[PDB]
Structure formats: structure tokens, C-alpha cells
Assembly symmetry: C3
Amino acid sequence: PFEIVFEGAKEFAQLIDTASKLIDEAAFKVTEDGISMRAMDPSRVVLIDLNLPSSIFSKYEVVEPETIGVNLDHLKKILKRGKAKDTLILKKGEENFLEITIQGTATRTFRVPLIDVEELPFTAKVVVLGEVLKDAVKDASLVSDSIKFIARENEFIMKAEGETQEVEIKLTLEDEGLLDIEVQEETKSAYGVSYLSDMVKGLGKADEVTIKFGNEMPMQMEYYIRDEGRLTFLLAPRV
Amino acid sequence: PFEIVFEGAKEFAQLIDTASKLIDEAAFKVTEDGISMRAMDPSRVVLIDLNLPSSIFSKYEVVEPETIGVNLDHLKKILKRGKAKDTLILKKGEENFLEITIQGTATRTFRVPLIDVEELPFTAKVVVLGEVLKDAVKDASLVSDSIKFIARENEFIMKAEGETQEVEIKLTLEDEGLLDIEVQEETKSAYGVSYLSDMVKGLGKADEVTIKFGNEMPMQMEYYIRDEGRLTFLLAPRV
Amino acid sequence: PFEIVFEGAKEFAQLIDTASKLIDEAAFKVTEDGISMRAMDPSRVVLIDLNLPSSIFSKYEVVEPETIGVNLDHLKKILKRGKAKDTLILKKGEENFLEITIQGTATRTFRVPLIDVEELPFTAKVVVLGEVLKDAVKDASLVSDSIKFIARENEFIMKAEGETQEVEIKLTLEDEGLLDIEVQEETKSAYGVSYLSDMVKGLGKADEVTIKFGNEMPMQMEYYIRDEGRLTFLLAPRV
């Protein structure tokens, strides 16, 4: 069916690690154009959409298109064996088995059984640095389990208050953190910090994150893996 | 009342972290000259005297003098959010609330409720490197809960023995560790290693530590934070 | 009896640390030529043979030959106090006490009581990089408690399978990992991963490891500490 090679096994491990913090089971659609995966977290709050085009792979050969289901927690522990300079080879041919090869000084091939997996009018859009978003969520985690997103004409505010203390992060476009802001009407919404904590991990300091959300509306978070691999989250608002 | 800015949020976090290992509650006197704090550990063995002059702050503006009480364990977790290059802003104006702002790529402002806090003839003086003192205490921690301090005319000895093993550290002025030694009469005293372990943390390898103590007498340990900020411990002798 | 000095206290600590993961009690024979130690793991599966010649020591003076018994777990915690650039001095003279001196900025001398300790036709030989052997064992640890060693005329295979998954590492001399291979007849044998995990720790990426084993036969693993200090393991085959 296919032979797929990814340079930098550790970074691919982190990518799967990030997803594994929200999902445990997922089906990967392997086509001629790339690898796509759409899964949902157990609490049905987060929709994860991962798109890995062939351009981010050193070698991409798919003889026949196929959808495979893997255990991300199982897959993660194997991918963590790879170093930063290691080469990752994803081979599939034994009908119901996935070959995971970590190639560095030597060639180490894992053999994993495949499993059966069952397969918005945003009024505010902002583009923020991954660092700022990461720090803001962690800050909110100290004071509350809930973080509020506020977007005005020329300012973006992330605010969280608890029983005793409070944290607030304001961005006004003239700052380094905020790169772009497109707001139609004043937009307020609150989300679970615990969820945002998991989907914010793996973010680089230079990563550009696009956030779309509305009043009492789910938010869409999107950034790119190696500039071509798209990772999109759809987070439901806090009840 | 005041606006105080400190460059290097992580180092300030470590300073509060060090104190938090001995005290949980403390009152900070904020004057025109600097910030001072005098608190005592729960076991009433250690007296901590911290002095932070305005010279170690990038911006020091105190409109009106005031004494504020904070939870160091609470304060510590917030200050740990700051990086090494981060900017720390301590703002106070809302009568009973302290604003803690971590400023790096973006501006993140915490809001913390203030709490109500209730506010020797040394015969031997030595000046030792922070590294030597740190290593000696940790060495003593392996063999005993008690460490003995011995100071002669031209030698300084830290010795600890347990039930089975023993460690000894001798300094004779001609060594790199000992920089100065002023001893009137032969001086012996023992102290709790657990306490010395906490007050020795955060010490640099180049820090100069001045130790004063006497026979069956409490010891005074003092070194400087950024060459101007004075940190002084008063440790009672072992019973 | 002797005064022995070793430059690089941290590396010596790691050496004792590695052995301590297999043995808890051992007798060290100190002669004019070097220090040797032969002990066995509690489960009587592994024989450890350590040889430390005088050439790896900065100063080696043995007045009288002697065999001393120490607690490696006790010894390890003391040696961990030493840094990479620290100097280690092993002094013995008080008949039943060992002096352990860590010398860096200052001189810290420990005093430890000595204890009383009670003192193959290989058909396949391979020389492999320490990195490859380390990675292979860790890979096998994920899928099974048993790892199989296979050596053919011009290929060396380490294979492990569990209940659901499988890992395989093939080396064919033309690879970077395999440096030499001398095989008489086809050789197969299996060993416990848990044991191999402990004796593979401390291995460098550039270390050359010589492995000798036979059909249903114990394996001999050998590499060198600082090119002169020989460390040899004798691991029994899996039942």
C-alpha cells in the first residue's frame, strides 16, 4: 500500500504525542496527496484535524490508498525511541500490520498490529505567536479551570479569574504577540483551560497560530507543522 | 503606593523560592530606599532578613510607603511563569491587591489578594565561596542530620558524623574556598543540616558568603543578591 | 595500604552506578597493577568482572596489597557528590575504614566502614557500537521481557516479540553499527531484557562492545572504560 519516510523522528513523535494527549484512538487516511486524520476527544469537546501533505516527507510512495487505525498511546511510546536526527519510515504491506522503522546508526523495525477504529460563523479572527498563547494558557491554569477570550476592534484579551486571584493578558496589535486581528462585532467566549493546555503543547515560539471564535461559540485553533502540515483544533465553549 | 520593576523574572522567582523553603508567610516593607522583609521559620530556628535596595531594580517608584503581606508559596508559583529574560513588574494601588506583571513577548498581569501577616557576640568570622558551603552541607546531609562548625586561628572545619560514616571539610585560608578568616578564640558549634540545606540553595559558585558564629551560639549567614541585595540568615544552634 | 587518585569523579560514579544496578555487595582486590572486582547479581544470572589498571589513574600508590568489601549502594551516593572536573581520592590506612575524598574547589573527605563480603565455547563473536546495542535493548524492552540474539555468516540480528507487537534489528557488517563479525555456525540464543537493560547503561555512542555467545549458551559482553579499564559481563541465557 505505501512507504512513507519522515526526517526527524523526534519531531514526529512530539506531533503524535500532542494528539495523544487529547485522543487515544484514531484512523489515518493515507492517500497519494498526504496523510489526514480526524478524531474526537473522549469528552467530545475537541475535534482534531491533522493534515500531513507529501511535501513534508522525504519520500512519499503510496501504491494503493488505505485507511488505517492505530493506538496513539502505543504508537507514541515507539516513536519516542527516535532521536532528533533519526529517520522514520512508515511501511504498510502486511494487510493488518504497520511497520515502524527508526533509522539512525542502525535500522530498527517495529511491527504493530492495526486496530479497528470508528471514523461556523466566526465573528473574530486573530493571529498570535505560539509563545504568547502557550504562556497565557499556563497563566490561566494557575488561577482557574476556565479562560475567557475577548476580541474587540483593535485588541485581543485573554482573561481568567478564580476564587481569590486573577490573570489578564491584553494584546493590541501594536504588540509583538499579535500579528493580525479581524473583528466584526465584539466577541466574548469562555473555554476549558485543561483542554487548551493539551492543544497548546508542542507549540514553538515562532509558530503563527490563527484563532477563530464567536459569542458563546466554539473556537478554531490552527497552526502549521513544518509550514505545510496543518493542525486544526475545534474546541467547544465552556458550559 | 508603588511601581517596582525587576529585570530577570526567573532570578527573582528563585529568590522568593529560596525564602519559601523556610517561610510561608511574610510581610514586605516597601519604602523609598528599597524592599525589606523580616520573617521567621515555623520551627522558630531561622530568622530571615532580606534587603532589596532600589539599585537592583530597573525602575523604582514609591508614591507612598506601605507594608504588604503575601503568601510566598502563592507568590512563588506565579513568579515561576517568568523566564530569564522576562521583565517583572510589581504594582500596588488597589489598596488590598498586588499586581504581578510578567512582561516578555506579551504582557501578562496577575492580580493577587494581600493577606494580614503578624510582623550576638560572634567569636569567629569566615568568608567562603558559595560552592564550597553548598557542597559541604549536601555532603553532611548524606551522613547526618547534624553538622558541626569549627573555626581555629588559620583553619575552618565543617564536620559531620552519623551512626556508621563520617564526612569532613577542612579549609585553611590558602585554599580557594576560604577567602577570609577572623577568629578570636577556638569556636565550636553544631547546626541542623535540614535547615542549612534550604538556606544554601540558590547560591552561585562565585558568591561570597560571610559566616559568623560562636560557641554554643547561633550562626549568621550572609551573602548578596546581585551585589547589592542583602540576604541574611540567623540560624539557632542544634539542641 | 594504598592511595589511589582518579580524575573525573562523576565518570567513576557512573561506573559504580552501573555496577550497582546489578550488584549490591562486592569485594575490590587492590594490587600493584590495578583494581579488580568479581561479583554476581542476586539472581545469579550475571557475572560482573571489572578491571581497573593503574594506567587509568592519575596517581596509583599501593604500599601493601589488600582486598576490601564495600556497599556499592552506599558508595554510589557519595561518589555522586562529585562533579565532572572533580578529583577523586581513594585512601585506605585505618585497617577497616575507606577514605573517599572529593577534591575540587575544596577538599571533602568521607569516611566509610568496610564490610565483610564473601568472594565457554562461543560460536559467534560480534563487535558492535555501544549506541546500537543500547537502542536495541530499549526497543526490545517495549515489546517483550525477552530478546533473541541471532548471528549468521555475515549478519547479526537482535529480535524480540511479545503478545501483540514485535521489533527487529538487523546488522550486516556493511552497516555503521557492526564493526566485526566472526561466526562459525549459525547461532541463536535468548536473554532477559531487564538484565541487558542494566548492563547496557553508561555505554557511550562511540564505545566498541564485543559480544560472544552460543546456542542455548550464556553471552559475554565486554567493553572498555577509558580504553584501558575492562568491564566484562557474563549473562546466562533465558530459561
